[PDB]
Design a protein around this ligand. Structure first.
Ligand SMILES: NC(=O)C1=CN([C@@H]2O[C@H](COP(=O)(O)OP(=O)(O)OC[C@H]3O[C@@H](n4cnc5c(N)ncnc54)[C@H](O)[C@@H]3O)[C@@H](O)[C@H]2O)C=CC1
Ligand SMILES: Cc1cc2nc3c(=O)[nH]c(=O)nc-3n(C[C@H](O)[C@H](O)[C@H](O)COP(=O)(O)O)c2cc1C
Ligand code: SF4
Ligand code: SF4
Ligand code: SF4
Ligand code: SF4
Ligand code: FES
Ligand code: FES
Ligand SMILES: [Mg+2]
Lengths: 62, 230, 431, 217, 59, 42
């Protein structure tokens, strides 16, 4: 079986905001690394671009 | 500027021209159900799972392909859109094989989750299901096409992202199948991504087969070192 | 002002060579009045032709019935750099329908002249006629007529003493009923599978080769030169309001003399059948049901057919729709359930399979109707089949799903006792 | 009900990429004309006519013919495979000299198309989807062929045989066996689908040019 | 209905019924089941480890 | 006059009649438009 010696291997906390997590980590005396949230950037979708007259976006099959 | 005012469940939002109904609903915080639409691929509009009701309109529209018009009110949780979702899920599950215990994508299935969240809880399909023969496209992707829902995500990804036109649809109607029509291996430096894009267990990782379940795995975010892209 | 319809004078018809008894070549068309003063009609301008088509009250002969003037004026926008094309829908896929084949094989010069007139009205540089693949001899006749038109200068470089260049191409399909749908037809022309594309974009914006395009039925294109020559008021004098003109009718099934005939628009169904088809085999009382507008229209029983008019509005009021004006009759000695199941099997074999509702649901309804024919089902499944048809209808990419759901709905609505009685006979005989 | 034809290709000694196929120079000129019919930015629009010409030259469509078409039109072979497998007029297996297509759709089924099918089966000694031992005839059930007025009807190699009775179709079959082509068109002498004894329309001579031309034109 | 000692069953042909779906391991309220699996020599989906801790099981 | 059927030319159509007619018509067509590229894959 998989054995462990640390008690914090399964401890995961949920926070509403980044500031709440940072404050909780600071008041508990834990050194922390913060990663900025990754958001998928908005994209331009056009069904009519599939059947293009002169561009490469024209599809060969559908 | 050129922003237009549209409504999602009665709440106003300003969107750029050409924005689809799905993106307008995303700007509010709702994810419309989908099977064939991918943000990275060209719009297909064939799974019909994204059908949604526009207020004062008798016919539902495909949210992934329909550009939103100024003043539209999208009823994302009306009885019409819910009934459309239930009907589409029923049609999708009519021929699907009872392979969940043996399917590698048990706890990671978009079909399973969207059936739980938007479909019914029972079936009235009393006929026999279809079965299609599997394909061999190399040692990386395992192919079980009875689970395929014909969303054509793999074909679009291969054509547009991987630059390989070896995938397509043969046949017609219910007997239309996704494949190569010949014994040919889909080998490219980006061939493994069709496993991720496939919403069902039709395409699965062959070296990963049968080894683990998603709820058991611990997720570590790291960086690739196989090349200099990182 | 007129109240009674159904007596169209012979000299007042358009397709004067419907039966192929005259010369279909250029000389016969010139004798019958084709290619006459087309130069002046071309010189009147697209706006005048569009106005004539609009005041004519013409509606699409394909089945949709959309006002042709509005569709053709959707192309009256200025050029943006792309070429403009007119596509003639000659796929001819609906069971019970034979009109386009006859007006192509016997009156091809009317079709070519209508192509030229529509292209001028819409500013199209060329016309692509998508003929059915099975109609090889009809396509060859159309090619011969187009060659005659090119030799005479009626089409091509300057096409007249007019200054307008217009080309007419014939492209053959290969065995696909779905290729009659306008977007599926456009895809099939471009060399792909006959899978329809979503709307928007409409063909007037993005069509064949990504260019502005109008897809028009063969009859709609063929009647335009006569409408221009005789005026839109004359064509509007026929039929009821919003239902003006004349129509080609195909009567097939259980009639003594199945035939194709052109008749005034809002003709009564029984009067049409008795005067042209020779009546129902075994008499009018022997009639059981009628499919009035091809396989996509729901059936109606004899009681409805007693006093029903053959036009868009009155047939919609009968919960049927005019469709392609293809009348399929059925007497009391035939299995209505078997015929409806055969139609559903046709739709199952003709669906392109692009979208899940049509594909899966139509296969499901085919299986359900096959079980219904033998009576191997239970009465509670009729409402389940109705709900399945509701789920298919209005949720598909194209109207093939609607055209498959509607016959089931009509059959259920008008013959539920028949299905229940068949099921109970099966139940007693199998215990 | 069911299809019965597979949409996956397995290499076979008589159907493989090494199977010899090439276009006759006259067919090459025809291909040039077909390609010329389309704008010189979209050459893939000619896949259907070129595949049809290949079938007419060969009788059916081997995988080598599809590969040749794809190479000639510079399109991926998978697109040609999709076109070949989507459209029902393409024969991906060898077919008899005379391909007999019998329509069993409801308008023809009403006018006893089953009798025509049974007569053909009894005369040829084959089932619905089989081929004769001498590779001369092939029987196939098809949907509406656009000749519902002249039901029942069959199609044999681009020709329509209409208003058929079992005797009439037996005569057609044995005369086609004899060697010369029977005349196409309806039987019973009704001259392409007007009422058999009715003549209820188009009785008087058609009006000439300018009969009803409006004023100011 | 009474629950006794755990056992792994097999089909009448003699092949074991377990297909390593790990649903029992997921549902086990005491985490008494440990499962490891891989494709078999014939490609079947079978377990290589199936452990039940009877001193953790709640039956 | 009317009783005579005059669509008899189609009984003598061969396997290449359509394509031969297209080849004949090839010389009557206006030059085709161009999208600027050899193919969308270019
Ligand atoms: N003639 C035949 O052989 C067949 C006829 N049909 C009939 O076709 C009917 C349904 O076909 P659909 O074309 O899908 O119906 P539709 O109403 O959507 O199309 C009607 C025509 O009007 C155009 N149109 C409609 N709305 C438009 C808009 N807002 N803007 C611009 N253009 C617009 C469409 O482009 C189309 O050409 C059915 O009722 C069926 O009976 C079906 C199969 C075969
Ligand atoms: C599945 C399907 C098949 C169709 N097949 C044909 C056809 O064979 N011929 C035709 O004229 N219209 C056909 N239509 C209707 C076309 O959409 C129609 O040609 C188009 O709407 C324009 O028709 P119009 O010129 O009469 O207005 C079909 C429609 C559907 C949904
Ligand atoms: S793909 Fe999803 S729904 Fe289908 S068998 Fe696999 S886990 Fe179950
Ligand atoms: S294999 Fe997967 S991605 Fe490809 S069409 Fe089928 S379900 Fe979609
Ligand atoms: S409704 Fe049927 S024929 Fe029409 S696009 Fe969908 S699957 Fe294809
Ligand atoms: S893993 Fe557990 S639940 Fe799944 S088959 Fe094996 S014993 Fe049954
Ligand atoms: S997500 Fe819109 S139709 Fe598939
Ligand atoms: S039903 Fe047979 S030709 Fe149409
Ligand atoms: Mg997958």
């Amino acid at each position: 079986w998989s054995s462990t010696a640390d008690p914090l291997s399964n401890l995961v906390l949920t926070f509403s905001t980044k500031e709440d997590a940072v404050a909780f980590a600071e008041k508990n005396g834990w050194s922390f690394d913060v990663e900025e949230r990754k958001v998928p950037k908005p994209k331009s979708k056009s069904y009519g671009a599939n059947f293009s007259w002169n561009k490469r976006t024209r599809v060969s099959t559908k | 500027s050129n922003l237009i005012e549209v409504f999602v469940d009665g709440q106003s939002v300003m969107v750029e021209p050409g924005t689809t109904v799905l993106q307008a609903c995303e700007k509010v915080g709702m994810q419309i159900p989908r099977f064939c639409y991918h943000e990275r691929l060209s719009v297909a509009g064939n799974c019909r799972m994204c059908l949604v009701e526009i207020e004062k309109a008798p016919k539902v529209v495909a949210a992934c392909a329909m550009p939103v018009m100024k003043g539209w009110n999208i009823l994302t949780n009306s009885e019409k859109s819910k009934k459309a979702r239930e009907g589409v899920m029923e049609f999708l599950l009519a021929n699907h094989p009872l392979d969940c215990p043996i399917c590698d994508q048990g706890g990671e299935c978009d079909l399973q989750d969207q059936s739980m969240m938007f479909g019914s809880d029972r079936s009235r399909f009393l006929e026999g299901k279809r079965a299609v023969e599997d394909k061999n496209i190399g040692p990386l992707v395992k192919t079980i096409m009875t689970r395929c829902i014909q969303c054509t995500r793999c074909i679009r990804f291969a054509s547009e992202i991987a630059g390989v036109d070896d995938l397509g649809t043969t046949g017609r109607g219910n007997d239309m199948q996704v494949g190569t029509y010949i014994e040919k291996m889909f080998m490219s430096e980006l061939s493994g991504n069709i496993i991720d894009i496939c919403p069902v267990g039709a395409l699965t990782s062959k070296p990963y087969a049968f080894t683990a379940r998603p709820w058991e795995t611990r997720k570590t975010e790291s960086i690739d070192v196989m090349d200099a892209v990182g | 002002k007129k109240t009674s319809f159904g007596s169209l004078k012979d000299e007042d018809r358009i397709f004067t060579n419907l039966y192929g008894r005259h010369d279909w070549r250029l000389k016969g068309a010139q004798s019958r009045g084709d290619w006459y003063k087309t130069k002046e009609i071309l010189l009147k301008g697209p706006d005048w032709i569009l106005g004539e088509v609009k005041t004519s009250g013409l509606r699409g002969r394909g089945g949709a019935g959309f006002p042709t003037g509005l569709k053709w004026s959707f192309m009256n926008k200025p050029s943006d750099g792309r070429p403009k094309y007119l596509v003639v829908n000659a796929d001819e896929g609906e069971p019970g329908t034979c009109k386009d084949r006859e007006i192509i094989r016997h009156d091809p010069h009317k079709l070519v002249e209508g192509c030229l007139v529509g292209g001028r009205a819409m500013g199209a540089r060329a016309a692509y006629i998508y003929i059915r693949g099975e109609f090889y001899n009809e396509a060859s006749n159309l090619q011969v007529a187009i060659r005659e038109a090119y030799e005479a200068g009626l089409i091509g470089k300057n096409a007249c003493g007019s200054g307008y260049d217009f080309d007419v191409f014939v492209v053959r399909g290969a065995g696909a009923y779905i290729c009659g749908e306008e977007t599926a037809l456009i895809e099939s022309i471009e060399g792909k599978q006959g899978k329809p594309r979503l709307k928007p974009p409409f063909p007037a914006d993005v069509g064949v080769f990504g260019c502005p395009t109008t897809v028009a039925n063969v009859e709609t294109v063929a009647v335009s030169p006569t409408i221009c020559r005789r005026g839109g008021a004359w064509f509007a004098s026929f039929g009821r309001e919003r239902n003006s003109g004349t129509k080609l009718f195909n009567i097939s099934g259980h009639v003594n003399h199945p035939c194709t005939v052109e008749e005034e628009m809002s003709v009564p169904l029984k009067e049409l059948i008795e005067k042209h088809a020779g009546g129902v085999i075994g008499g009018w009382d022997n009639l059981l049901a009628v499919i009035p507008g091809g396989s996509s229209t729901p059936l109606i029983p004899k009681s409805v057919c007693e006093t029903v008019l053959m036009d868009f509005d009155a047939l919609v009021q009968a919960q049927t729709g005019l469709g392609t004006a293809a009348v399929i009759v059925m007497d009391r000695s035939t299995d209505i359930v078997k015929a409806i199941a055969r139609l559903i099997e046709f739709y199952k074999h003709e669906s392109c399979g692009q979208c899940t509702p049509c594909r899966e649901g139509v296969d499901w309804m085919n299986k359900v109707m096959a079980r219904f024919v033998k009576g191997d089902a239970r009465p509670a499944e009729i409402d389940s089949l109705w709900e399945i048809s509701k789920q298919i209808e209005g949720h598909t990419i194209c109207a093939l799903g609607d055209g498959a759901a509607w016959p089931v709905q009509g059959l259920i609505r008008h013959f539920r006792p028949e299905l229940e009685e068949r099921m109970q006979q099966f139940a007693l005989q199998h215990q | 009900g069911a299809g019965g034809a597979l949409f996956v290709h397995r290499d076979t000694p008589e159907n493989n990429p090494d199977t010899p196929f090439d276009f006759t120079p006259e067919n090459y000129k025809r291909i040039e004309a077909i390609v010329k019919n389309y704008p010189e930015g979209h050459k893939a629009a000619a896949v259907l006519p070129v595949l049809d010409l290949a079938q007419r030259q060969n009788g059916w469509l081997p995988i080598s013919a599809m590969n040749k078409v794809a190479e000639i039109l510079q399109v991926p072979p998978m697109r040609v495979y999709e076109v070949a497998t989507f459209y029902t007029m393409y024969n991906r297996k060898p077919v008899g000299k005379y391909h007999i297509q019998v329509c069993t759709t409801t308008p023809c089924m009403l006018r006893n198309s089953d009798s025509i099918l049974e007569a053909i089966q009894k005369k040829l000694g084959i089932k619905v989807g089989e081929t004769t031992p001498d590779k001369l005839f092939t029987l196939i059930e098809v949907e509406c062929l656009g000749a519902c007025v002249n039901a029942p009807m069959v199609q044999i190699n681009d020709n329509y045989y209409e208003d058929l009775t079992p005797k009439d179709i037996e005569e057609i079959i044995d005369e086609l066996k004899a060697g010369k082509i029977p005349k196409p068109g309806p039987r019973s002498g009704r001259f392409s689908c007007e009422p058999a004894g009715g003549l209820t329309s188009l009785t008087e001579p058609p009006k000439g040019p300018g009969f009803g031309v409006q004023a100011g034109l | 209905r009474f629950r006794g000692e755990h056992a792994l069953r097999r089909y009448p042909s003699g092949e074991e019924r377990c297909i390593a779906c790990k649903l029992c391991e997921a549902v086990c309220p005491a985490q008494a089941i440990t499962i490891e699996a891989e494709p078999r020599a014939d490609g079947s989906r079978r377990t290589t480890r199936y452990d039940i801790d009877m001193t953790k099981c709640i039956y | 006059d009317n009783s005579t059927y005059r669509n008899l030319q189609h009984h003598e159509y061969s396997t290449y009649t359509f394509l031969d007619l297209n080849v004949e018509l090839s010389k009557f067509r206006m030059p085709q438009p161009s999208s600027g590229r050899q193919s969308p894959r270019h």
